[PDB]
Amino acid sequence: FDETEIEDFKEAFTVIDQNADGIIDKDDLRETFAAMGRLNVKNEELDAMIKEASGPINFTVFLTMFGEKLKGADPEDVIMGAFKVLDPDGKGSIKKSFLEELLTTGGGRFTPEEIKNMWAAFPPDVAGNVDYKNICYVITHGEDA
Amino acid sequence: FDETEIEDFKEAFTVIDQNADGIIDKDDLRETFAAMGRLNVKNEELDAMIKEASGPINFTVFLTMFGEKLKGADPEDVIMGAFKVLDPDGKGSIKKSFLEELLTTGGGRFTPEEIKNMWAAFPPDVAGNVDYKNICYVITHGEDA
Amino acid sequence: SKAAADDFKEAFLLFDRTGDAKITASQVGDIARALGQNPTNAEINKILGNPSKEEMNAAAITFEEFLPMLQAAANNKDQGTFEDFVEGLRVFDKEGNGTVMGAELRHVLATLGEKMTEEEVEELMKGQEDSNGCINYEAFVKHIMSV
Amino acid sequence: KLLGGGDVDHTQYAFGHTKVFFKAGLLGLLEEMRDDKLAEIITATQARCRGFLMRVEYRAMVERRESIFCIQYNVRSFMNVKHWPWMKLFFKIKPLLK
């Protein structure tokens, strides 16, 4: 965890903790979702978020919960560092079959089935290994941009 | 309703509510139309807009009225998503007869008569199913661009 | 037999567009395939005519005719041997590697024997043939037998 | 390439530099038997294909299921709305925004 990433989680903690007392309760979760447009947010969704913690969601409990789910989270500059080492001549997005062979043949984390799941929402270019960069974006901030 | 679309309706609500009290009355409707160039806006048009609500037009009454008229409203990125799946090779606008056959033969909402009305203001290319994209524009924002 | 599989009757309610519990004779070929049976279209045609049943005029159905026609087609599933499917395509292209050139398999599947539309041929090659123009039929016939 | 198709005896003929060679009436007889034997072999191989062919159509039909609806309803809106004061207003106005 770099310090600017921890400051981003402190700003997200303050936007969900609308009572500003330092502990995100279930009312803060529901009023942050209603301010984003969720008028139908069920109480069972709020209870499932609170069921991931053993205590009240203060800043260090929110940081330890996000730490334990993001144990391989990598910032965009280090993902582009590794992709610039995979394309060491610069500019070009690397081939689809080169990333499939190098993921498998180096590591068990790069096994195929997982490579079909990589192509599956990370579209073609991303999946193929040709583009580059959009995948670093969606690994640090999810969903389609 | 995505949150940026709800923020667009909040900005349109503030431009029509020129008294800034949170409720669009008939004077706000008339003074917004006069500021757009409508010097002859009749009082019966303002009364027909207010007759679509059961109460005063505050922000949640304006959102529920627009929700109930736009129950199949689709943003431009999801309409272009579906048209990229209809043209999966990219770039090309799809044929006129292919969209007429696939609208009818899949669904009852794609029946012909309705397909003649689709060609009728959505011009040729649009109607035909060759161009693409201008129809996504006019479905999210009406009238000729 | 029931093993009474009552899900064949529940799938007949998903293919009948009128909800009256009848399925036209033109849908019976594709619904036998969707229940896990692959009778050839000439076989589906013969059987029909064999029983003085005309698929040329309006047709309705009842579950009481569709059930025994699916049970008469179910004995013919012993014809689905994958040795002969992969050896057919292995005799269709030279060298010791299972690759058909793209247009060879597309024109043969549309024009040889039971005509498959070129729309269905493109939907069966989509993903298994890459931009080299070579269809690996070892994985292609594997994925065709996965459905 | 042509002879590629047909439920014909791929024996009974023979090619060469200027022409094909073909049997009748024995070799002719052979082929015939052969011909029937492929309908079998073939007819059966056709079916699965046919079968399978439509089996992929269902996977597409189904996928499509909603994307249509989305398209379906979505249009309808507009047809209704585009004539609504408030909506035209939003329209001329939608631009001044940021």
Coordinates of C-alpha atoms in Angstrom, one line a residue:
Chain A
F1 CA 0.0 0.0 0.0
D2 CA 1.5 3.3 -1.2
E3 CA 0.5 6.4 0.8
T4 CA -1.6 8.0 -2.0
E5 CA -3.6 4.8 -2.3
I6 CA -4.3 4.9 1.4
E7 CA -5.3 8.5 1.0
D8 CA -7.7 7.5 -1.7
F9 CA -9.2 4.9 0.6
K10 CA -9.5 7.6 3.3
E11 CA -11.4 9.9 0.9
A12 CA -13.7 7.0 0.0
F13 CA -14.2 6.3 3.7
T14 CA -15.2 9.9 4.3
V15 CA -17.7 9.8 1.4
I16 CA -19.4 6.7 2.7
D17 CA -19.2 7.9 6.3
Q18 CA -21.7 10.8 5.9
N19 CA -22.1 11.1 9.7
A20 CA -18.3 12.0 9.9
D21 CA -17.7 10.2 13.2
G22 CA -15.2 7.7 11.9
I23 CA -17.3 4.6 11.8
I24 CA -19.4 3.5 8.7
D25 CA -22.6 2.1 9.9
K26 CA -25.5 0.6 7.9
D27 CA -27.2 3.9 7.6
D28 CA -24.1 5.4 6.0
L29 CA -24.0 2.6 3.4
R30 CA -27.6 3.1 2.5
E31 CA -27.4 6.9 2.3
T32 CA -24.3 6.7 0.1
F33 CA -26.0 4.3 -2.2
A34 CA -29.2 6.5 -2.3
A35 CA -27.0 9.5 -3.2
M36 CA -25.5 7.5 -6.1
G37 CA -29.0 6.6 -7.4
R38 CA -29.8 3.4 -5.5
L39 CA -33.3 3.9 -4.2
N40 CA -33.9 0.1 -4.0
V41 CA -30.8 -0.9 -2.1
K42 CA -31.9 -3.9 0.1
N43 CA -30.9 -4.2 3.8
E44 CA -29.5 -7.6 3.1
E45 CA -26.8 -6.0 0.9
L46 CA -25.8 -3.7 3.7
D47 CA -25.8 -6.6 6.1
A48 CA -23.5 -8.7 3.8
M49 CA -21.0 -5.8 3.7
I50 CA -21.0 -5.6 7.5
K51 CA -20.7 -9.4 7.8
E52 CA -17.3 -9.2 6.2
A53 CA -16.0 -7.4 9.3
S54 CA -15.7 -8.6 12.8
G55 CA -16.3 -5.1 14.2
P56 CA -17.5 -1.6 13.3
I57 CA -16.1 -0.2 10.0
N58 CA -13.6 2.4 11.2
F59 CA -10.7 3.5 9.0
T60 CA -8.3 0.7 10.1
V61 CA -11.0 -2.0 9.8
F62 CA -11.8 -0.8 6.3
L63 CA -8.1 -0.8 5.4
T64 CA -7.5 -4.3 6.7
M65 CA -10.6 -5.7 4.9
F66 CA -9.5 -4.1 1.6
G67 CA -5.9 -5.3 2.2
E68 CA -7.1 -8.9 2.7
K69 CA -9.1 -8.8 -0.6
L70 CA -6.5 -7.0 -2.6
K71 CA -3.4 -9.0 -1.7
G72 CA -2.2 -8.9 -5.4
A73 CA -3.5 -5.4 -6.2
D74 CA -1.0 -3.5 -8.5
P75 CA -1.0 0.2 -9.3
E76 CA -1.2 1.2 -13.0
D77 CA 2.4 2.4 -13.2
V78 CA 3.8 -1.0 -12.1
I79 CA 1.5 -2.9 -14.5
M80 CA 2.7 -0.7 -17.3
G81 CA 6.2 -1.2 -16.1
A82 CA 5.8 -5.0 -16.6
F83 CA 4.1 -4.5 -19.9
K84 CA 6.9 -2.3 -21.1
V85 CA 9.3 -5.1 -20.3
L86 CA 7.2 -7.4 -22.3
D87 CA 7.2 -5.0 -25.1
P88 CA 10.8 -3.6 -24.7
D89 CA 10.8 -1.8 -28.0
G90 CA 7.9 0.4 -27.0
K91 CA 4.6 1.5 -28.5
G92 CA 3.3 -1.9 -29.8
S93 CA 0.7 -4.0 -28.0
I94 CA 2.0 -7.5 -27.7
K95 CA 0.6 -10.6 -29.5
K96 CA -2.3 -12.7 -28.1
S97 CA -0.4 -16.0 -28.4
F98 CA 2.7 -14.6 -26.9
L99 CA 1.0 -13.7 -23.7
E100 CA -0.8 -17.0 -23.5
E101 CA 2.4 -18.9 -23.9
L102 CA 4.4 -16.8 -21.5
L103 CA 1.7 -16.9 -18.8
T104 CA 1.4 -20.6 -18.9
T105 CA 5.1 -21.5 -19.4
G106 CA 6.4 -19.5 -16.6
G107 CA 3.9 -19.8 -14.0
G108 CA 0.9 -21.8 -12.8
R109 CA -1.1 -18.5 -12.4
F110 CA -0.8 -18.1 -16.2
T111 CA -2.5 -21.6 -16.8
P112 CA -4.8 -21.6 -19.9
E113 CA -8.6 -21.8 -18.4
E114 CA -7.6 -18.7 -16.5
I115 CA -6.4 -17.2 -19.9
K116 CA -9.9 -17.8 -21.3
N117 CA -11.3 -15.9 -18.4
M118 CA -8.8 -13.1 -19.1
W119 CA -10.0 -12.8 -22.7
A120 CA -13.6 -12.9 -21.5
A121 CA -14.3 -9.6 -20.2
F122 CA -11.0 -8.1 -20.9
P123 CA -11.9 -7.9 -24.4
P124 CA -9.9 -9.0 -27.6
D125 CA -7.1 -6.6 -27.8
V126 CA -6.7 -6.8 -24.0
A127 CA -7.2 -10.6 -24.0
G128 CA -5.1 -11.1 -27.2
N129 CA -2.3 -9.0 -25.6
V130 CA -2.1 -6.5 -28.4
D131 CA -3.5 -3.4 -26.7
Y132 CA -2.2 -2.5 -23.6
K133 CA -3.0 -0.1 -21.0
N134 CA -6.8 -0.4 -20.9
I135 CA -6.2 -3.6 -18.8
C136 CA -4.1 -1.7 -16.4
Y137 CA -6.9 0.8 -16.0
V138 CA -9.5 -1.8 -15.3
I139 CA -7.3 -3.7 -12.8
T140 CA -6.9 -0.6 -10.7
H141 CA -10.5 0.6 -11.3
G142 CA -12.9 -2.1 -12.4
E143 CA -15.8 -2.1 -14.9
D144 CA -15.9 -0.8 -18.5
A145 CA -14.6 2.7 -18.8
Chain B
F1 CA -31.0 5.2 -14.2
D2 CA -27.3 5.7 -14.0
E3 CA -26.1 8.5 -11.7
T4 CA -24.8 10.8 -14.4
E5 CA -28.1 10.7 -16.1
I6 CA -29.8 11.6 -12.8
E7 CA -27.3 14.5 -12.5
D8 CA -28.3 15.6 -16.0
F9 CA -31.9 15.7 -14.9
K10 CA -30.9 17.6 -11.8
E11 CA -29.2 20.2 -14.0
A12 CA -32.2 20.4 -16.3
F13 CA -34.4 20.8 -13.2
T14 CA -32.3 23.7 -12.0
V15 CA -32.5 25.4 -15.4
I16 CA -36.3 25.2 -15.5
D17 CA -36.6 26.1 -11.8
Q18 CA -35.4 29.7 -12.1
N19 CA -36.7 30.6 -8.6
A20 CA -34.3 28.0 -7.1
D21 CA -36.6 26.8 -4.4
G22 CA -36.8 23.2 -5.5
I23 CA -40.3 23.2 -7.1
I24 CA -41.0 24.0 -10.7
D25 CA -44.2 26.0 -10.9
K26 CA -46.0 27.3 -14.0
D27 CA -44.1 30.6 -13.9
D28 CA -40.8 28.7 -14.1
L29 CA -42.1 26.8 -17.2
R30 CA -43.1 30.0 -18.9
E31 CA -39.9 31.9 -18.1
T32 CA -37.7 29.0 -19.2
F33 CA -39.6 28.9 -22.5
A34 CA -39.4 32.6 -22.9
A35 CA -35.6 32.5 -22.3
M36 CA -35.4 29.9 -25.1
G37 CA -37.3 32.1 -27.5
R38 CA -41.0 31.1 -26.9
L39 CA -42.8 34.4 -26.6
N40 CA -46.1 32.8 -27.5
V41 CA -46.1 29.9 -25.1
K42 CA -49.8 29.3 -24.1
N43 CA -50.9 28.7 -20.6
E44 CA -52.6 25.5 -21.7
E45 CA -49.3 24.0 -22.5
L46 CA -48.0 24.8 -19.1
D47 CA -51.2 23.3 -17.6
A48 CA -50.8 20.1 -19.6
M49 CA -47.3 19.6 -18.2
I50 CA -48.6 20.2 -14.7
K51 CA -51.5 17.8 -15.4
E52 CA -49.0 14.9 -15.8
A53 CA -48.1 15.2 -12.1
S54 CA -50.3 14.5 -9.0
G55 CA -48.4 17.1 -7.0
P56 CA -45.8 20.0 -7.3
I57 CA -42.8 19.3 -9.5
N58 CA -40.0 18.8 -7.1
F59 CA -36.9 16.8 -8.0
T60 CA -38.3 13.4 -7.1
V61 CA -41.6 14.1 -8.8
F62 CA -39.8 15.1 -11.9
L63 CA -37.6 12.0 -11.7
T64 CA -40.6 9.7 -11.3
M65 CA -42.5 11.3 -14.2
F66 CA -39.5 10.9 -16.5
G67 CA -38.9 7.3 -15.2
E68 CA -42.5 6.3 -16.1
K69 CA -42.2 7.7 -19.6
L70 CA -38.7 6.4 -20.2
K71 CA -39.1 2.8 -19.1
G72 CA -37.1 1.6 -22.1
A73 CA -34.6 4.5 -22.3
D74 CA -31.1 3.3 -23.2
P75 CA -27.9 5.3 -23.1
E76 CA -25.8 5.7 -26.2
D77 CA -23.0 3.3 -25.1
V78 CA -25.4 0.4 -24.6
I79 CA -27.2 1.0 -27.9
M80 CA -23.8 1.0 -29.6
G81 CA -22.9 -2.1 -27.6
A82 CA -25.9 -3.9 -29.1
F83 CA -25.1 -2.6 -32.6
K84 CA -21.5 -3.8 -32.3
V85 CA -22.9 -7.2 -31.6
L86 CA -25.1 -6.9 -34.7
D87 CA -22.0 -5.9 -36.6
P88 CA -19.4 -8.0 -34.9
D89 CA -16.6 -7.4 -37.5
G90 CA -16.7 -3.6 -36.7
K91 CA -17.0 -0.4 -38.8
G92 CA -19.8 -1.4 -41.2
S93 CA -23.3 -0.2 -40.9
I94 CA -25.6 -3.3 -41.1
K95 CA -28.1 -4.0 -44.0
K96 CA -31.6 -2.7 -44.1
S97 CA -33.2 -6.1 -44.7
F98 CA -31.2 -7.8 -42.0
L99 CA -32.5 -5.4 -39.3
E100 CA -36.1 -5.8 -40.6
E101 CA -35.8 -9.6 -40.5
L102 CA -34.1 -9.8 -37.2
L103 CA -36.5 -7.4 -35.5
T104 CA -39.5 -9.2 -36.6
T105 CA -38.2 -12.8 -36.2
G106 CA -37.0 -12.5 -32.8
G107 CA -39.5 -10.4 -31.1
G108 CA -43.0 -8.9 -31.4
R109 CA -41.5 -5.4 -30.8
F110 CA -39.7 -5.7 -34.1
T111 CA -43.0 -6.5 -36.1
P112 CA -43.0 -4.8 -39.5
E113 CA -45.6 -1.6 -39.3
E114 CA -43.3 -0.5 -36.5
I115 CA -40.3 -1.0 -38.9
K116 CA -41.9 1.4 -41.3
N117 CA -42.2 3.9 -38.5
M118 CA -38.6 3.3 -37.7
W119 CA -37.6 4.1 -41.3
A120 CA -39.9 7.1 -41.3
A121 CA -38.0 9.7 -39.3
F122 CA -35.0 7.8 -38.7
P123 CA -34.0 8.2 -42.1
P124 CA -32.7 5.7 -44.8
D125 CA -29.3 4.7 -43.6
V126 CA -30.7 4.6 -40.0
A127 CA -34.0 3.0 -41.2
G128 CA -32.1 0.7 -43.6
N129 CA -29.7 -0.4 -40.8
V130 CA -26.6 0.6 -42.7
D131 CA -25.4 3.6 -40.7
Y132 CA -25.3 3.4 -37.3
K133 CA -24.8 5.6 -34.4
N134 CA -26.9 8.6 -35.5
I135 CA -29.9 6.6 -34.3
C136 CA -28.2 6.1 -30.9
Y137 CA -27.8 9.8 -30.7
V138 CA -31.4 10.6 -31.5
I139 CA -32.7 8.0 -29.1
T140 CA -30.9 9.6 -26.2
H141 CA -31.5 13.1 -27.4
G142 CA -34.4 13.5 -29.9
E143 CA -34.9 15.7 -33.0
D144 CA -32.6 16.1 -36.0
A145 CA -29.1 17.0 -35.0
Chain C
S1 CA -39.4 -44.3 -19.1
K2 CA -39.3 -41.7 -16.4
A3 CA -36.4 -42.8 -15.5
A4 CA -39.4 -40.5 -16.2
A5 CA -37.8 -37.3 -17.4
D6 CA -40.6 -34.7 -17.0
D7 CA -38.2 -32.0 -18.1
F8 CA -38.9 -32.9 -21.7
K9 CA -42.5 -31.7 -21.1
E10 CA -41.2 -28.6 -19.4
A11 CA -39.0 -27.9 -22.4
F12 CA -42.0 -28.4 -24.7
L13 CA -43.6 -25.5 -22.8
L14 CA -40.5 -23.4 -23.6
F15 CA -40.8 -24.1 -27.4
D16 CA -44.5 -23.7 -27.8
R17 CA -45.1 -20.0 -28.6
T18 CA -48.9 -20.1 -28.2
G19 CA -49.0 -21.8 -24.7
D20 CA -51.6 -24.4 -25.8
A21 CA -49.2 -27.3 -25.2
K22 CA -48.8 -28.2 -28.9
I23 CA -45.6 -28.0 -31.0
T24 CA -45.8 -27.8 -34.8
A25 CA -44.1 -30.5 -36.9
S26 CA -41.5 -28.1 -38.2
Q27 CA -40.2 -27.5 -34.7
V28 CA -39.8 -31.2 -33.8
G29 CA -36.5 -31.6 -35.6
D30 CA -34.8 -28.8 -33.6
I31 CA -36.5 -29.8 -30.3
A32 CA -35.2 -33.4 -30.6
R33 CA -31.8 -31.9 -30.9
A34 CA -32.4 -29.6 -27.9
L35 CA -33.4 -32.7 -25.8
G36 CA -30.1 -34.4 -26.6
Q37 CA -30.8 -36.2 -29.8
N38 CA -29.1 -35.8 -33.2
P39 CA -31.3 -37.3 -35.9
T40 CA -30.4 -36.2 -39.4
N41 CA -32.9 -34.0 -41.2
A42 CA -33.6 -36.6 -43.8
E43 CA -34.4 -39.1 -41.0
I44 CA -36.7 -36.6 -39.4
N45 CA -38.3 -36.1 -42.8
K46 CA -38.7 -39.8 -43.6
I47 CA -40.2 -40.8 -40.3
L48 CA -42.7 -38.0 -40.7
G49 CA -43.7 -39.0 -44.3
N50 CA -43.4 -42.7 -43.3
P51 CA -46.3 -42.0 -41.0
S52 CA -48.3 -40.2 -43.8
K53 CA -47.6 -36.9 -42.0
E54 CA -47.2 -33.9 -44.2
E55 CA -44.9 -31.1 -43.0
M56 CA -46.0 -29.1 -46.0
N57 CA -49.5 -28.2 -44.6
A58 CA -50.3 -26.6 -41.2
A59 CA -49.4 -28.8 -38.2
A60 CA -50.1 -28.9 -34.5
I61 CA -48.9 -31.2 -31.9
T62 CA -49.6 -32.9 -28.9
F63 CA -47.2 -34.2 -26.4
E64 CA -48.6 -37.7 -27.0
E65 CA -47.1 -37.9 -30.4
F66 CA -43.9 -35.9 -29.7
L67 CA -42.9 -38.2 -26.8
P68 CA -42.9 -41.4 -28.8
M69 CA -41.2 -39.7 -31.7
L70 CA -38.4 -38.6 -29.4
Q71 CA -38.2 -42.2 -28.1
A72 CA -38.0 -43.6 -31.6
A73 CA -35.1 -41.2 -32.3
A74 CA -33.3 -42.1 -29.1
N75 CA -32.2 -45.5 -30.3
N76 CA -30.2 -43.8 -33.1
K77 CA -27.8 -42.1 -30.8
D78 CA -25.5 -45.1 -31.1
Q79 CA -24.5 -43.6 -34.5
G80 CA -22.7 -40.6 -32.8
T81 CA -19.1 -41.9 -32.7
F82 CA -16.4 -39.3 -32.4
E83 CA -13.7 -41.5 -33.9
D84 CA -15.3 -41.2 -37.3
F85 CA -15.8 -37.5 -37.0
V86 CA -12.2 -36.7 -36.3
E87 CA -11.0 -39.2 -38.9
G88 CA -13.3 -37.7 -41.5
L89 CA -11.6 -34.3 -41.1
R90 CA -8.2 -36.0 -40.8
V91 CA -8.7 -37.4 -44.3
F92 CA -9.8 -34.0 -45.5
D93 CA -6.4 -32.3 -45.1
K94 CA -2.7 -33.3 -45.7
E95 CA 0.1 -33.5 -43.2
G96 CA 0.2 -34.7 -39.6
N97 CA -1.7 -31.9 -37.9
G98 CA -5.5 -31.3 -37.6
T99 CA -6.1 -28.2 -39.6
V100 CA -8.7 -27.5 -42.3
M101 CA -8.3 -24.3 -44.4
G102 CA -11.2 -22.0 -43.5
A103 CA -13.1 -21.9 -46.7
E104 CA -12.8 -25.7 -47.3
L105 CA -14.9 -26.5 -44.2
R106 CA -17.3 -23.6 -44.8
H107 CA -18.2 -24.5 -48.4
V108 CA -18.4 -28.2 -47.6
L109 CA -20.7 -27.6 -44.6
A110 CA -23.0 -25.4 -46.7
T111 CA -23.2 -27.4 -50.0
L112 CA -22.4 -31.0 -49.3
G113 CA -25.4 -33.2 -48.3
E114 CA -27.7 -31.5 -45.8
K115 CA -27.3 -27.8 -46.6
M116 CA -26.3 -25.8 -43.6
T117 CA -26.7 -22.0 -44.0
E118 CA -23.6 -19.9 -44.2
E119 CA -24.9 -18.0 -41.2
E120 CA -24.8 -21.2 -39.1
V121 CA -21.4 -22.2 -40.6
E122 CA -19.9 -18.9 -39.5
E123 CA -21.5 -19.3 -36.0
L124 CA -19.8 -22.8 -35.7
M125 CA -16.3 -21.6 -36.7
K126 CA -16.4 -18.3 -34.7
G127 CA -13.7 -18.6 -32.1
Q128 CA -12.1 -21.9 -33.2
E129 CA -10.6 -20.5 -36.4
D130 CA -8.1 -17.7 -35.9
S131 CA -6.7 -15.3 -38.5
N132 CA -4.2 -17.9 -40.0
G133 CA -7.2 -19.4 -41.9
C134 CA -6.6 -22.8 -40.3
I135 CA -9.2 -24.5 -38.2
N136 CA -7.8 -27.0 -35.7
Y137 CA -10.5 -29.7 -35.8
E138 CA -9.1 -31.6 -32.7
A139 CA -10.4 -28.7 -30.6
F140 CA -13.1 -27.8 -33.0
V141 CA -14.8 -31.3 -32.8
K142 CA -14.2 -31.3 -29.1
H143 CA -16.2 -28.0 -28.7
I144 CA -18.9 -29.2 -31.1
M145 CA -19.4 -32.2 -28.9
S146 CA -19.4 -30.1 -25.7
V147 CA -23.0 -28.9 -26.5
Chain D
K1 CA -11.8 -30.6 -55.5
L2 CA -15.3 -31.2 -56.8
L3 CA -15.3 -34.9 -56.3
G4 CA -14.8 -34.0 -52.7
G5 CA -18.6 -34.3 -52.3
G6 CA -21.1 -37.0 -53.1
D7 CA -21.9 -40.3 -51.5
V8 CA -19.8 -41.8 -54.5
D9 CA -17.0 -44.5 -54.7
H10 CA -13.8 -42.5 -54.5
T11 CA -12.2 -45.6 -56.0
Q12 CA -13.9 -46.0 -59.3
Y13 CA -12.1 -43.0 -60.7
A14 CA -8.6 -41.8 -61.2
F15 CA -7.1 -38.6 -62.2
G16 CA -4.3 -37.7 -64.5
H17 CA -2.7 -34.8 -66.4
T18 CA -5.5 -34.3 -68.9
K19 CA -8.4 -36.1 -67.6
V20 CA -10.1 -38.3 -65.1
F21 CA -10.7 -41.9 -65.5
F22 CA -13.9 -43.5 -64.5
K23 CA -15.3 -47.0 -64.4
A24 CA -18.7 -47.9 -65.6
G25 CA -20.2 -51.5 -65.5
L26 CA -18.7 -53.2 -62.6
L27 CA -16.7 -50.5 -61.0
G28 CA -20.0 -48.8 -61.7
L29 CA -21.7 -51.3 -59.6
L30 CA -19.1 -50.9 -56.9
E31 CA -19.5 -47.2 -56.5
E32 CA -23.3 -47.5 -56.3
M33 CA -23.0 -49.7 -53.3
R34 CA -20.6 -47.3 -52.0
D35 CA -22.9 -44.5 -52.7
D36 CA -25.5 -46.0 -50.4
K37 CA -22.9 -46.5 -47.9
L38 CA -22.2 -42.9 -47.4
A39 CA -25.8 -41.8 -47.1
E40 CA -25.5 -44.0 -44.1
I41 CA -22.1 -42.7 -43.2
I42 CA -23.1 -39.4 -44.6
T43 CA -26.8 -39.1 -43.7
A44 CA -25.8 -39.8 -40.1
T45 CA -23.0 -37.3 -40.3
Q46 CA -25.2 -34.8 -41.7
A47 CA -27.8 -35.0 -39.0
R48 CA -25.5 -34.3 -36.0
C49 CA -24.2 -31.3 -37.9
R50 CA -27.8 -30.1 -38.7
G51 CA -28.6 -30.8 -35.1
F52 CA -25.5 -29.1 -33.8
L53 CA -26.1 -26.3 -36.2
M54 CA -29.2 -25.2 -34.6
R55 CA -27.9 -26.0 -31.2
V56 CA -25.7 -22.9 -31.6
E57 CA -28.6 -20.9 -32.7
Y58 CA -30.4 -21.4 -29.5
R59 CA -27.2 -20.1 -27.6
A60 CA -27.4 -17.0 -29.7
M61 CA -31.1 -16.5 -29.6
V62 CA -31.0 -16.8 -25.9
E63 CA -28.0 -14.4 -25.4
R64 CA -29.8 -11.9 -27.6
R65 CA -32.8 -12.2 -25.3
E66 CA -32.3 -9.1 -23.4
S67 CA -30.2 -7.0 -25.7
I68 CA -33.3 -6.8 -27.8
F69 CA -35.6 -5.8 -25.0
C70 CA -33.2 -3.1 -24.2
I71 CA -33.4 -2.0 -27.7
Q72 CA -37.1 -2.8 -27.8
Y73 CA -38.3 -0.6 -24.9
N74 CA -35.6 2.0 -25.4
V75 CA -37.0 3.1 -28.8
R76 CA -40.6 3.2 -27.7
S77 CA -39.6 5.7 -25.0
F78 CA -38.4 8.1 -27.4
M79 CA -41.3 7.9 -29.7
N80 CA -43.4 9.1 -26.8
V81 CA -41.1 11.5 -25.4
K82 CA -39.8 13.3 -28.4
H83 CA -43.2 15.0 -28.6
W84 CA -43.2 16.2 -24.8
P85 CA -42.5 19.9 -24.0
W86 CA -40.4 19.1 -21.1
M87 CA -38.4 16.8 -23.1
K88 CA -37.8 19.2 -26.0
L89 CA -36.8 21.7 -23.4
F90 CA -34.3 19.4 -21.8
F91 CA -33.1 18.9 -25.3
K92 CA -32.4 22.5 -26.3
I93 CA -31.0 22.9 -22.8
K94 CA -29.0 19.7 -22.5
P95 CA -26.1 21.5 -24.2
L96 CA -25.6 24.6 -22.1
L97 CA -24.7 22.1 -19.4
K98 CA -21.4 20.7 -18.4

